[PDB]
Symmetry: C4
Subunit: 173 residues, 4 copies
């Protein structure tokens, strides 16, 4: 229950306007450019402020490539059927910067008519105090526009694995 | 899936307060004069600002009669059982005018006690990038007051046909 | 369908926050003194402004006793098991008065701990243009506190009968 | 029906944003620190202002230990698997104080990463006028964080027993 129950809470934390029930194979969806932007930026802002939000026993974790914070990738048709992959890494200092210069980068000027998808990925670490067992949560938020139907499908994927209790930082401690 | 999935997105784009599920044979309904006005004007305003809203690969299309923009028709009992049909054509320049003089025309001074229906019709063009196939969407928004029961039923009808890829303008490109 | 469909519209017009589906044997309910007041005053205000709200082919009708406007009755335990019935008649001039002095009467200083129920009753007249047949709607809004359980159950009752087409006044004509 | 129907009304009165239907074995839930605080403080504030809210025939009652008002208890892991229980008693004078100094106590500086649960308990007295029978309601609001899953489950428990009609004070009388 610990890993599965944390996944539900992550959907409520990171998916803007999540109703509490998945729409279909995806958690929720958007139909406008404004709502797509607001959902992407909400997920990033909730990650940035996670210590003042979460009710769990969690902390930030390093990614698979040792980069810290969020990896934001996007796929879009090249200007001229070829698909181009672009990624940006937003660490904790990037997200805490004032002005938050990362929001004005060219990466976030999305061209929805040729955008296939946006993916946000990050790791969280959690401790199961009720049993202690430490988990690494590999989280991915996918903004799927591959159908190009006017609807973006939003998925929250979380793979959790038991790991050694090494990372000390738990939010609120 | 492309034409059918675009129809769902059109309901979210053009029907004010659409819950995401059709009420019955119609998509949604209104019970007040204020809500009837707000739903009609919302559909027109969403069409006017479509390039900054849609997540799809769409553009405006010409109507069957070569008129551009929206055709708004209304049916009402004549002043004196005979039904009178009145139509107005709102092109892109009409909708972009400041002040938007079209909103103050006598056509939009509705008399609900004798109004049978209001119909908004327009064409959109779309490209199925996932497969390319070009579609013409013949859209009709019907505000049905024929029951005169205090409830206006709102339908969104879309007939989509495959056509030659001739029109160049796709929103955001 | 005409009389039954008008009843649905009346629930949307006169019952504050009506969800569109009846809760149980009653249409909706309230759990606070503020919400009870707001629902009662909303029903009265919607009646007062009915000509600028309804989408139907309706007009005001005289009551069974020839009094015009709304009859508001309340039942409460006497100060000292005996039930006392008090009524007020709010005609169209009472509801249009500025200040609306009727709202400050002692009748509307409700004592919820001993209040059994509040009843609002009025007649509306309607014409079935689709077929013409004229209907008299005998409407009653009941705020039922007889259980004294902390929940007021709100019912909308409408009995409609075919009558001669004599009354001329239809809202918006 | 009297005791059971009052329980439904208590859920609407004391549980912030209660939808009217229990989520599962609990009435509702929260996923953020802000929402946890807002739900706890709402329950206390609704108790404090109960005379201007309830539609029932109720009054405040003494607790099992003769203390008046609310007992708020919390369970949390000690700083250094041992569980510590801390309680505060908020009487009617504490809740009516300006500034309400009770809100700034160290007790209400919650540490969610080690918080097991928060419990609010109080008694209400009610009279069944429809039949008179007097009831004592032993109410408990539990904010359950024992899973440490990121979700706090909120329960409303009410045990009601018939007692002698001795307490005079009924709200609004
Ligand atoms: Cl935008
Ligand atoms: Cl892009
Ligand atoms: Cl209006
Ligand atoms: Cl008209
Ligand atoms: Cl009040
Ligand atoms: Cl009263
Ligand atoms: Cl907070
Ligand atoms: Cl604590
Ligand atoms: K998984
Ligand atoms: K069709
Ligand atoms: K009836
Ligand atoms: K019980």
């Amino acid at each position: 229950a610990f890993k599965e129950d944390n996944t539900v809470a992550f959907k409520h934390l990171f998916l803007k306007g999540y109703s509490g029930t998945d729409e279909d194979d995806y958690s929720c969806s958007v139909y406008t450019q404004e709502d797509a932007y607001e959902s992407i930026f909400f997920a990033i802002n909730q990650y940035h402020q996670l210590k003042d939000i979460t009710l769990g026993t969690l902390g930030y974790g390093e990614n698979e490539d040792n980069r810290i914070g969020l990896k934001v990738c996007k796929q879009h048709y090249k200007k001229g059927n070829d698909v181009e992959l672009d990624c940006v890494q937003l660490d904790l200092q990037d997200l805490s910067k004032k002005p938050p210069d990362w929001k004005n980068s060219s990466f976030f000027r999305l061209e929805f008519y040729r955008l296939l998808q946006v993916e946000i990925s990050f790791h969280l670490k959690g401790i199961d105090l009720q049993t202690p067992d430490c988990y690494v949560f590999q989280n991915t938020i996918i903004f799927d526009n591959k159908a190009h139907s006017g609807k973006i499908k939003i998925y929250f994927d979380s793979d959790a694995k038991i790991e050694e209790c090494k990372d000390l930082n738990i939010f609120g401690s």
